[PDB]
Amino acid sequence: LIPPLINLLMSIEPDVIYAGHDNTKPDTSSSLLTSLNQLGERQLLSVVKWSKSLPGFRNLHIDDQITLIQYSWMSLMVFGLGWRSYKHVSGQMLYFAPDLILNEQRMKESSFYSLCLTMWQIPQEFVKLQVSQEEFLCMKVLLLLNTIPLEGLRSQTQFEEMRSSYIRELIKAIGLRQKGVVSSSQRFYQLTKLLDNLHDLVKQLHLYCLNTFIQSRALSVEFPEMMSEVIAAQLPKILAGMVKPLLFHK
């Protein structure tokens, strides 16, 4: 049977989030990017709502909760993109939302296409490894908790215990399917290495974001208010490497 924390994680997953994308026009660069940012705004709200129901998270110092969301939001979004792409279209298109699904044809602009190829690595890996829902849900919590400030968190003890609890839960999720301690251990290595490797992937998205944000008026790309604040609050600092990514492996 499914362990209870994993069932709970299933229960607190967000409902379907639409981009509000007007698929009557053809997209220019600016309209496509504006629509993705609009979806991003809706997804950021969803992430904060999700965190309020995530066992353990609400008990961290509020400053730590805000910090962790501000550090991890891009990571959580691209990881979720990967999941939806894996689930709905077998990793072969990028399933941003049910009203915003991009195939290669719709990826005209050079830099955005390159960004998409980077993002595509996640669903490709989900397909290759045959990641389960139970594994995904635990890994997703670990991503929220995968980067801390250089000086640590105010609730560092609580945070460490929470992170340990979800590591143990990933081990249970793996154990649902991987039988044998070697197969299970090898799988744990694989899934945690994927998370380690996400730090490098997300750096590329961070840079793209800040570039687009700084150039937003010139590119005619709208950045809604909540996303603008998360970007302004932490992205330059994160990009400068003044944070501590946590790694499972050396």
**Among all residues, whose Cβ is closest to ligand OR8?**
209
Closest CA to 69 of 222, 234, 214: 234
| Residue ranges in 44-73 that form contacts with ligand OR8 under rule CB under 6 A | none
- Is 106 annotated to bind a ligand? Reply is no
Broken C–N links (> 2.5 Å) in the chain, after residues: none
Is residue 148 near ligand OR8 by the rule CB under 6 A? no
- Nearest CA to 204 among 96, 117, 84, 128? 117
Q: Does 96 bind ligand OR8 (CB under 6 A)?
A: yes
If one counts every other C-beta atom within 10 angstroms of the C-beta of residue 15, the result is 5
Question: Is residue 40 part of the contact set for ligand OR8 (CB under 6 A)?
Answer: yes
Return the percent helix, strand and coil in the chain, to nearest 5: 70, 5, 25
Choices 61-69, 76-84, 85-93, 103-111 (CB under 6 A): range interacting with ligand OR8: 76-84
209 binds ligand OR8 (CB under 6 A): yes
Q: Can you tell me whether residue 240 is helix, strand or coil?
A: coil
* Residues 210 and 41: beta-carbon distance below 8 Å: no
Residue 85 or residue 178: which is nearer to ligand OR8 going by CB? 85
Distance between CA atoms of residues 173 and 183, nearest Å: 13
| Region binding ligand OR8 by CB under 6 A among candidate stretches 38-46, 103-111, 148-156, 185-193 | 38-46
Closest distance of CB 18 from ligand OR8, Å? 11
CA-CA distance, 36 to 43, in Å (whole number)?
10
133-144 and 62-89 are packed helices; what angle lies between their axes, rounded to 10 degrees? 150
Q: Are 93 and 103 in contact (CB under 8 A)?
A: yes
Among 5, 6, 68, 78, binds ligand OR8 (CB under 6 A): 78
Number of residues that bind ligand OR8 (CB under 6 A): 15
Q: 3-class SS at 27?
A: coil
For residues 152 to 191, the per-residue mask of contacts with ligand OR8, x marking binding by CB under 6 A and - elsewhere, is: ----------------------------------------
Phi, psi at residue 245, to the nearest 5°? -70, 135
Q: Determine which residue in the list 65, 85, 212, 234 makes contact with ligand OR8, applying CB under 6 A.
A: 212
**Site membership for ligand OR8, residue 113 (CB under 6 A):** no
- Give the interface with ligand OR8 as residue ranges (CB under 6 A): 33, 36-37, 39-40, 43, 74, 77-78, 81, 96, 205, 208-209, 212
Annotated binding site for progesterone: 84
